[PDB]
Design a protein around this ligand. Structure first.
Ligand SMILES: CCCCCCCCCCCCCCCCCC(=O)OC[C@H](CO[C@@H]1O[C@H](CO[C@H]2O[C@H](CO)[C@H](O)[C@H](O)[C@H]2O)[C@H](O)[C@H](O)[C@H]1O)OC(=O)CCCCCCCCCCCCCCCCC
Ligand SMILES: CCCCCCCCCCCCCCCCCC(=O)OC[C@H](CO[C@@H]1O[C@H](CO[C@H]2O[C@H](CO)[C@H](O)[C@H](O)[C@H]2O)[C@H](O)[C@H](O)[C@H]1O)OC(=O)CCCCCCCCCCCCCCCCC
Ligand SMILES: CCCCCCCCCCCCCCCCCC(=O)OC[C@H](CO[C@@H]1O[C@H](CO[C@H]2O[C@H](CO)[C@H](O)[C@H](O)[C@H]2O)[C@H](O)[C@H](O)[C@H]1O)OC(=O)CCCCCCCCCCCCCCCCC
Ligand code: CLA
Ligand code: CLA
Ligand code: CLA
Ligand SMILES: CCCCCCCCCCCCCCCCCC(=O)OC[C@H](CO[C@@H]1O[C@H](CO)[C@H](O)[C@H](O)[C@H]1O)OC(=O)CCCCCCCCCCCCCCCCC
Ligand SMILES: CCCCCCCCCCCCCCCC(=O)OC[C@H](COP(=O)(O)OC[C@@H](O)CO)OC(=O)CCCCCCCCCCCCCCC
Ligand code: HEM
Ligand SMILES: CC1=C(/C=C/C(C)=C/C=C/C(C)=C/C=C/C=C(C)/C=C/C=C(C)/C=C/C2=C(C)CCCC2(C)C)C(C)(C)CCC1
Ligand SMILES: CC1=C(/C=C/C(C)=C/C=C\C(C)=C/C=C/C=C(C)/C=C\C=C(C)\C=C\C2=C(C)CCCC2(C)C)C(C)(C)CCC1
Ligand code: OEX
Ligand SMILES: [Cl-]
Ligand SMILES: [Fe+3]
Lengths: 334, 105, 33, 134, 58, 102, 141, 59, 93, 254, 37, 53
């Protein structure tokens, strides 16, 4: 009945087409200015001095750059992790040369998915249900915090963060594995077992549902037309798909509780991407991966190479050739 | 390496570094005299072994040239080699170093 | 030439592992908990 | 293996035999007292003079023998014998400024300097070369 | 799908055109020239230290 | 010669034992042995340059980089407007189509 | 048969220091004549740097005189510690222990008058730390 | 002094009996209503022996 | 440049060629690197080979140490691309 | 904003504010500096700050039109001034009082942007400056002037985007190996973007004292500097640039 | 190192930080002995 | 307070674990010490220049 409560009951109303709740008062204007700067600086941004060595990199669609090469380039390394908005520049094109578009996208995108994560809580409150889909979105939000914010916090400049582009992510991965050895890190090792394991259990659980459907349908028409939406009964025998997979491996290697099965779908990729997002952030403070270089020695003391040395000859070759004229001293950030 | 090439007789300013910028001594974006190279991102460092060489406008080019007392070369050569860069099995290096030291900071 | 340290480090580890399931193993035996 | 650890003692070619214990004593003391600056014969803070078999021979006392390396850690000089680089390098003379040199004996300077000459005999291209031989 | 031939003609005909794709090609020649003496030892790649592509100062 | 697996290869010169003698180096400073240091001479035989031998150190490096491609040939490439990267044979295009269809 | 060892038996790969004790004498003497002369040598150097602070108080440039008390005189409290644990008697050691403590207290009050930009207050803390420096040197002999 | 050495060695012997037999005696169905100052005697001699080890460390 | 005829003098041989050679090319001769080759790269001999023996601010025992290796030095026309990185060169082991 | 007002500031209040590169004025007139013909002399602390970067561009380019210096905008940061360009002044040509270059931060690598979107980089330097002025007194007039050699922007060991360089680097477009496999008249000869030339050109300066002080604190005057820009190691033609800002110096008696 | 009276107990204080890992694993032993009720 | 006991029991057992492996020639950071730098910041045992006695 108040002049504010009539506004306060519109924001927290579930009658809208998209939910526009109190976390959506922050993520709608921040993502829309992380979209409007990303779309413009992918098409028509000028070349950006990323390294602070006065050699600009041209990553927008006007300057060549088919879309598996274009990127919103990160900031200048002379700027560093200094706060660089538009009003702290002498002009708007001087702001574009130092790569000001990268912190304007990535501080609004990170603040937008942090309030997407609260908005994913918020509709699970107004609809009256269990609220932990915000916890499952905390694995991509941390992983988008690890490559974009925490790796620029630990490693100095904002130029070490991931470029907003497709070929920039492949450049970010080769430079990372040169200096941090992420492939032999035991927490990235868990994350690819939650990425392959999560891709296994999607192809495993999604198979055993669709292979044990009860036929509420004809022969020639599509199978999906037999599940009327909002029905009460289950559309597949859980007891037959359990008796399938209890014959495949053995009887007690399979969940005939479908709630403990579906929790195991929400636990294996989400904990794995939680451990990847830690690993990139602990390698941001240079707690690197395992280093078994030159470990195997014979009785005379001659070095016998193992399989971690042939990784290292790759790791050294992408170490001397990344940042090919940005180094003046023999050790990399030591 | 500002010390070592000055001890080989270089004018350590007017370095003419490889990209055209300063190799040893450089200019900060706010206009201070800072160290050049990749270490220009860490230009806002206040450290007690170099702050006796900073004047009001950054690093003084006269105090660097003369009063560069050898306890600072002790602390620079120690802190360069004792960098926070390690491994999970405690190997000190730039992640491509052979193992002969157990040091993570 | 006897080591005398990892003898002492593992004879004290055997004391330590005989503490935690020496509370529970007597408590299972005596119906307490 | 490891039958010949026949490093030269001083000039004119008198040699010495190290023994197995003085080599495990040497490698464990070269590590964690030297090898944070000399990881495989390089010098990390002065890389154009290192622990090569060639570059140790081309000094004004040639340091390819153990008796000029015992005299090195007791009293260091520069690469041309003129100055005394002791306030920027750890030694027995400067063991007040460098606390790692405070406790080790003369008998394990022979073990440390036995390790500098053994390493080009078993790891010849890798010792003193940079990362190219890693 | 190694290279974009539109951008290799341009980067040879402009010595200030650079992208993350063009930085990704130089990282591949670091991998293929440093690992080759160790990965394929039957070929006997006896590359000296002056001819393999290093960057600057490291 | 560069093998088929590579795409860029350093132009190193070997004798009949495998040992290097000249390398046309990437780093000219403190290069221990180069094309003009050891002074290699090209003696062409057969073809268009039957008997043309020259010891000019800039012109030896030109036909040194080409001869790691296997054999030198004069190309007419103002006809199809050629771009300069090696294409693939119909032996290798058939096998891409047929081992992916199968 | 492989030569295997169980929890000791110091071969080339055994990571145990229950063997490998030191045999010879410690050839660094802990307080000899050569570095005690070097501690006297830096006391000639450090007294010239506190003498040099007076012209930078008059020039009112603070980051020189807040920096020149850390530039050469960083190894001053370490060398003043080594001189007072070198003397023989204990009742003369109290006289050197007290004015080393009255030096340190005087020195940082000059630093507190340096950050606050107090020219009239830093000139008395400079001269009080100066005569405490000369009171130190005839206390240690 | 080595008389301190056997004192703190007697502390680690007595606290090994204390850390096992205190939660056995509390969480039995009996043995707590009967033996409270069997624990507080053992806890008293443990806190007693620390004080005796404490000012003997000054000497 | 792409072609340079004086590349065999810059190290990896004898005949250092003092005008555009690096400071660490004098490491291969004993008694030569740290402070006696300070005055060979500073106030350099851009005249001839025997201009380096008539150079000043040397001790007379330093001038005799150059005389042991007089045939391991030439004088080339000074290229400006190598004079700039005469002291650092970006070349560490 | 003199020297004696600037040295009282702490580093914690100069850092970040853009005041650390501002070429400190003075406040003095009715003075002179006498330079004796026998005594030794040195300029020290010679801070030089430009303003209004202007690149000469053609407007007609056929006939009947000049090359008007179009005003640009600065593009890097506030990194552009020079600091501490000391050098000996006591040499005296049949009068003239010349000072040669000794050391200091001679150069500052900044880029400016023309109208049209093209960014020209240049190396604003005063390296090898030999500036003479008529007379023996210094103050309120007595314009110095001399030639400085700029070096090239990139050095010889600057690697390209494709790994080519002058001192280092590849000597062929190695990503186009079929163009290298031609034997006659097509063997990457189209590219002389490959042969990198470290070329060195010269620039002129002329500076007026415009104020003095008879004790120290020499000029806080103005300067006009004509100069070439970056040629990309001999790939594109350099433009002329005209800089006109404020320098400041200090003569000590040696 | 340790004080010279307590230097014999150096094998005792080498595994005493590992005891807070054992207190987490004691709760799984105590739950399994009662039968996870 | 059982759990507040095991926080203090870590601080008791780790600080005795740091000082058992002390080796006084090395600095604090070359041995992986994590609670002894917290006590040397408070000035217990630290001398001039950063060395501890
Ligand atoms: C959800 C994610 C949402 C993210 C939204 C991001 C945009 C929102 C607005 C900004 C919020 C903070 C982001 C920047 C944090 C940062 O740059 O932090 C850096 C700062 C430290 O600042 C540094 O401080 C240093 C101070 O050193 C100086 O002073 C020292 C002491 O004298 C030394 O002497 C030194 O020599 C001297 O240089 C320097 O100034 C550096 O330049 C400066 O970077 O940390 C600090 O202030 C204290 C710690 C701050 C919090 C850091 C948290 C980072 C985000 C965690 C998200 C986790 C997500 C989990 C899953 C979901
Ligand atoms: C069904 C389940 C199946 C199992 C799955 C579940 C597995 C649970 C996890 C087990 C992991 C621990 C295994 C044992 C690890 C170990 O033995 O480890 C060995 C070490 C101790 O070993 C000693 O390690 C020492 C390291 O010291 C060295 O390093 C020091 C510091 O780096 C100093 O630099 C010093 O110079 C140097 O001495 C030496 O190498 C010794 O020779 C060596 O004996 O144990 C330690 O320290 C461990 C101490 C606890 C570490 C606390 C966490 C610290 C890091 C948190 C942040 C990392 C986040 C990313 C991680 C991914
Ligand atoms: C409500 C009113 C909002 C007014 C917003 C505004 O006044 O918006 C003004 C800005 C544009 O400002 C202009 O930004 C330009 C940026 O130039 C750059 O971008 C240009 C785009 O063609 C060229 O490519 C040019 O070469 C390149 O340097 C110039 O700096 C101009 O001086 C400056 O006026 O529009 C934008 O942000 C677009 C916002 C969407
Ligand atoms: C949901 C709203 C929202 C939020 C949270 C932000 C947040 C931000 N914007 Mg932004 N922006 C928005 C909408 C929003 N924007 C819209 C709609 C537009 C289009 C007009 C823009 C256009 C825009 C531009 C053009 C720029 C930003 C920038 C920024 C950053 C710093 C701005 C600043 O200093 O704030 C000032 C904030 C305060 C003084 C509040 C501080 C105190 C409060 C209570 C918070 C305290 C938090 C906690 C208690 C600690 C910051 C990440 C700048 C940038 O690039 O950053 C890198 C920048 O240049 N914004
Ligand atoms: C021969 C087939 C085969 C087999 C048996 C494995 C098995 C394994 N791989 Mg592997 N891998 C394979 C092919 C194979 N891979 C191929 C073709 C590639 C691409 C080149 C990879 C790339 C790959 C990466 C990058 C990594 C593994 C890892 C692993 C381990 C854990 C993965 C996991 O939990 O998955 C999920 C499965 C279940 C939960 C069941 C596991 C030992 C990871 C590892 O190191 O873990 C030890 C790791 O980091 N693999
Ligand atoms: C077979 C091999 C293999 C596999 C399976 C993986 C797998 C993985 N790697 Mg890995 N890697 C490999 C080889 C491999 N790698 C090799 C060989 C290298 C060395 C070159 C690396 C180097 C490497 C690095 C350096 C990193 C990884 C990372 C990762 C993880 C990426 C997925 C993730 O966490 O994103 C999680 C999801 C996101 C980040 C997306 C966030 C989504 C946000 C919240 C919203 C989306 C906005 C969007 C625009 C909206 C849509 C628009 C709408 C209109 C539809 C994953 C575990 C990364 C990692 O673990 O940390 C992040 C990482 O940093 N790898
Ligand atoms: C972020 C924090 C989150 C929590 C993380 C911590 C908990 C995670 C578990 C990690 C801890 C595992 C147990 C501790 C291992 C190290 C102990 C050690 O040996 O120190 C290793 C150290 C080595 O001592 C070294 O000495 C050197 C001196 O020359 C240096 O001073 C080194 O700094 C020093 O580390 O001491 C020992 O050698 C003790 C050996 C005693 C032998 C028995 C130890 C048994 C310990 C494991 C018992 C099983 C419990 C395992 C966990 C079970 C569940 C999987
Ligand atoms: C809450 C509702 C707010 C209004 C609607 C939102 C409109 C969103 C606009 C699109 C984004 C534009 C991004 C700027 C893009 C950008 O970078 O602009 C930068 C632009 C460039 O400046 P110049 O480079 O020309 O600087 C001048 C110098 O170069 C001259 O030497 O600055 C402007 O011209 C002014 C633009 C802001 C003017 C805004 C109006 C100011 C009035 C404020 C009123 C406050 C009251 C509001 C009451 C609620
Ligand atoms: C066991 C200890 C050590 C040994 C045997 C050792 C050995 C040597 C030797 C023989 C030299 C050559 C001296 C010369 O030719 O003039 C040298 C040079 C050098 N060492 Fe060490 N070293 C030790 C410890 C260290 C440490 C810990 C550091 C790091 C602080 C260090 C830094 C240097 C430097 C900088 C040089 C080069 C000197 C120069 O440039 O003139 N040394 N070392
Ligand atoms: C003098 C000294 C010593 C000794 C010491 C001692 C003897 C101590 C004692 C100590 C002790 C004696 C301690 C104890 C502690 C304990 C604690 C701290 C506990 C805790 C507990 C808990 C935590 C529990 C929990 C739980 C519950 C409640 C129920 C169920 C579950 C669980 C199990 C989890 C030595 C020789 C070493 C050295 C020198 C010094
Ligand atoms: C101070 C001290 C002390 C104390 C100690 C303590 C306090 C202890 C505690 C505690 C403990 C020590 C505990 C224990 C634990 C144990 C163990 C032994 C571990 C583990 C186990 C396990 C791991 C198993 C598990 C399982 C089950 C059964 C169920 C499920 C499955 C599984 C397998 C998981 C004393 C007095 C002696 C003296 C000396 C020093
Ligand atoms: O830029 Mn991107 O990045 Ca990973 O590092 Mn540090 O800064 Mn550069 O380096 Mn090596
Ligand atoms: Cl650098
Ligand atoms: Fe399902």
């Amino acid at each position: 009945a108040s002049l504010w409560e009539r506004f306060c009951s519109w924001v927290t109303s579930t009658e809208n087409r998209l939910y526009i709740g109190w976390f959506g008062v922050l993520m709608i204007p921040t993502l829309l200015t992380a979209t409007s700067v990303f779309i413009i600086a992918f098409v028509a941004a000028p070349p950006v001095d990323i390294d602070g060595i006065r050699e600009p990199v041209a990553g927008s669609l006007l300057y060549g750059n088919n879309i598996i090469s274009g990127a919103v380039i990160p900031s200048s390394a002379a700027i560093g992790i200094h706060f660089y908005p538009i009003w702290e520049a002498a002009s708007l094109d001087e702001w574009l040369y130092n790569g000001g578009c990268y912190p304007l996208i990535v501080l609004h995108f990170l603040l937008g998915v942090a309030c997407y994560m609260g908005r994913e809580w918020e509709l699970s409150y107004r609809l009256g249900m269990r609220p932990w889909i915000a916890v499952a979105f905390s694995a991509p939000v941390a992983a988008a915090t690890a490559v974009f914010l925490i790796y620029p916090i630990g490693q100095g400049s904002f130029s070490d963060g991931m470029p907003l582009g497709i070929s920039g992510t492949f450049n970010f991965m080769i430079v990372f594995q040169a200096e941090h050895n992420i492939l032999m890190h035991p927490f990235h090792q868990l994350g690819v077992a939650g990425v392959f394991g999560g891709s296994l259990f999607s192809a495993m659980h999604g198979s055993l549902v669709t292979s044990s459907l009860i036929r509420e349908t004809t022969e020639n028409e599509s199978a999906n037309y037999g599940y009327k939406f909002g029905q009460e009964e289950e559309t597949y025998n859980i007891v037959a798909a359990h008796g399938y997979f209890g014959r495949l491996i053995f009887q007690y290697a399979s969940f005939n509780n479908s709630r403990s099965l579906h929790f195991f779908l929400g636990l294996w990729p989400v904990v794995g991407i939680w451990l990847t997002s830690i690993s990139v952030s602990t390698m941001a403070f240079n707690l690197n991966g395992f280093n078994f270089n030159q470990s195997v020695v014979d009785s005379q003391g001659r070095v016998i190479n193992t399989w971690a040395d042939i990784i290292n000859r790759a790791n050294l070759g992408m170490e001397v050739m990344h940042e090919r004229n940005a180094h003046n001293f023999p050790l990399d950030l030591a | 390496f500002l010390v070592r090439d000055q001890r080989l007789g270089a004018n350590v300013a007017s370095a003419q570094g490889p990209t055209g910028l300063g190799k040893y001594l450089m200019r900060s974006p706010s206009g201070e005299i800072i160290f050049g190279g990749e270490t220009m991102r860490f230009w806002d460092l206040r450290a007690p072994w170099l702050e006796p060489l900073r004047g009001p406008n950054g690093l003084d080019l006269n105090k660097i040239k003369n009063d560069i007392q050898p306890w600072q070369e002790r602390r620079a050569a120690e802190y360069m080699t004792h960098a926070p860069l390690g491994s999970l099995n405690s190997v000190g290096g730039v992640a491509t170093e052979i193992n002969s030291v157990n040091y993570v900071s | 030439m006897i080591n005398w340290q990892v003898i002492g480090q593992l004879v004290s580890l055997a004391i330590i592992v005989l503490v935690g399931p020496a509370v529970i193993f007597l408590l299972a035996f005596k119906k307490g908990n | 293996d490891d039958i010949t650890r026949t490093i030269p003692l001083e000039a004119s070619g008198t040699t010495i035999t190290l023994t197995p214990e003085q080599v495990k004593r040497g490698k464990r003391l070269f590590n964690s007292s030297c090898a944070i600056c000399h990881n495989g014969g390089i010098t990390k803070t002065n890389p154009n003079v290192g622990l090569d078999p060639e570059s140790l021979s081309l000094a004004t006392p040639p340091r390819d023998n153990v008796n000029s390396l015992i005299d090195y850690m007791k009293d260091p000089t520069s690469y041309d014998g003129s100055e005394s680089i002791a306030e920027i390098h750890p030694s027995i003379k400067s063991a007040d400024i460098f606390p790692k040199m405070r406790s080790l004996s003369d008998d394990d300077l022979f073990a440390i300097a036995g390790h500098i000459l053994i390493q080009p005999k078993v790891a010849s291209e890798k010792w003193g070369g940079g990362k190219i031989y890693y | 799908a190694y290279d974009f031939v539109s951008q290799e003609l341009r980067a040879a005909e402009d010595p200030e055109f650079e992208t993350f794709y063009t930085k990704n090609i130089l990282l591949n020649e670091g991998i293929r020239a440093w690992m080759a003496a160790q990965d394929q030892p039957h070929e006997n790649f006896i590359f000296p230290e002056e001819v393999l592509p290093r960057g600057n100062a490291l | 010669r560069m093998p088929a697996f590579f795409e860029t290869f350093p132009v190193i010169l070997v004798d009949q034992d495998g040992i290097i003698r000249a390398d046309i180096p990437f780093r000219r400073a403190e290069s221990k042995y180069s094309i003009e240091q050891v002074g290699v001479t090209i003696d062409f035989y057969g073809g268009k340059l039957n008997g043309q031998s020259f010891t000019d150190a800039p012109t030896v490096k030109k036909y040194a980089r080409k001869a790691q491609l296997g054999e030198v040939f004069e190309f007419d490439r103002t006809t199809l407007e050629s771009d300069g990267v090696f294409r693939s044979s119909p032996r290798g295009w058939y096998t891409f189509g047929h081992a992916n269809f199968a | 048969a492989p030569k295997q060892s169980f929890f000791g038996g110091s071969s080339a790969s055994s990571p145990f220091v229950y063997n490998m004790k030191q045999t010879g004498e410690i050839l660094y003497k802990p307080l000899n004549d050569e570095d005690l002369q070097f501690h006297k040598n830096v006391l000639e150097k450090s007294r010239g740097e506190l003498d040099r602070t007076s012209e930078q108080i008059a020039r009112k440039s603070w980051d020189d005189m807040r920096g020149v008390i850390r530039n050469q005189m960083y190894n001053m409290r370490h060398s003043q510690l080594r001189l007072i644990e070198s003397v023989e008697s204990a009742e003369k050691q109290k006289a050197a222990k007290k004015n080393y403590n009255d030096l340190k207290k005087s020195l940082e009050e000059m630093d507190l008058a340096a950050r606050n930009k107090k020219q009239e207050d830093a000139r008395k803390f400079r001269a009080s730390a100066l005569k405490a420096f000369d009171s130190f040197t005839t206390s240690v002999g | 002094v080595t008389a301190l050495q056997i004192l703190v060695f007697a502390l680690t012997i007595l606290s090994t009996i204390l850390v096992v037999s205190i939660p056995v005696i509390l969480a039995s169905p009996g043995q707590w209503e009967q033996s409270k100052n069997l624990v507080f005697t053992g806890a008293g001699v443990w806190s007693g022996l620390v004080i005796v080890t404490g000012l003997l460390n000054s000497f | 440049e792409m072609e340079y005829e004086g590349v065999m003098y810059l190290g990896g041989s004898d005949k250092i060629d003092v005008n555009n050679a690096n400071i660490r090319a004098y490491t291969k001769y004993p008694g030569m690197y740290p402070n006696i080759a300070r005055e060979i790269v500073k106030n350099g001999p851009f005249e001839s080979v025997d201009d380096v023996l008539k150079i000043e601010t040397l001790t007379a025992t330093q001038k005799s140490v150059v005389e042991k290796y007089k045939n391991n030095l030439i004088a080339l026309p000074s290229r400006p691309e190598y004079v700039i990185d005469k002291l650092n060169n970006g070349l560490y082991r | 904003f003199t020297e004696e007002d600037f040295r009282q500031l702490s580093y914690e209040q100069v850092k970040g504010t853009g005041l650390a590169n501002r070429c400190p004025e003075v406040d003095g007139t009715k003075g002179s500096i006498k330079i004796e013909k026998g005594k030794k002399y040195k300029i020290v602390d010679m801070c030089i700050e430009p303003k209004s970067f202007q690149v000469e561009d053609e407007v007609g380019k056929g006939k009947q039109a000049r090359k008007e210096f179009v005003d640009t905008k600065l593009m890097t940061r506030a990194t552009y001034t020079l600091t501490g360009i000391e050098g000996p002044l006591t040499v005296n040509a049949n009068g003239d009082l010349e000072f040669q270059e000794k050391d200091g931060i001679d150069y500052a690598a900044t880029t400016v942007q023309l109208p049209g979107g093209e960014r020209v980089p240049f190396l604003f330097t005063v390296k090898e400056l030999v500036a003479t002025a008529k007379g023996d007194s210094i103050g309120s007039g007595t314009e110095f002037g001399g030639e400085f050699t700029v070096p090239s922007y990139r050095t010889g060991l600057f690697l390209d985007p494709k790994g080519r360089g002058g001192v280092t680097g590849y000597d062929m477009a190695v990503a186009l190996p079929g163009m290298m496999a031609d034997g006659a008249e097509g063997q990457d000869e189209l590219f002389k973007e490959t042969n990198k030339v470290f070329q060195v050109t010269k620039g002129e300066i002329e500076m007026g004292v415009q104020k003095v002080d008879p004790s120290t604190n020499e000029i806080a005057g103005v300067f006009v500097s004509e100069q070439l820009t970056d040629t990309d190691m001999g790939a594109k033609a350099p433009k002329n640039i005209l800089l006109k800002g404020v320098f400041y110096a200090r003569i000590v008696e040696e | 190192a340790l004080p010279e009276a307590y230097s014999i107990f150096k094998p005792l204080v080498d595994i005493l930080p590992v005891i807070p890992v054992f207190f987490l694993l004691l709760a799984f032993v105590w739950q399994a002995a009662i039968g996870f009720r | 307070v059982a759990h507040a006991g095991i926080m203090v029991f870590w601080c008791g057992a780790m600080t005795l674990f740091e000082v058992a492996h002390f080796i006084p020639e090395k600095p604090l950071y070359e041995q992986g010490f994590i609670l002894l730098p917290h006590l040397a910041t408070l000035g217990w045992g630290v001398g001039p220049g950063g060395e501890i006695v």
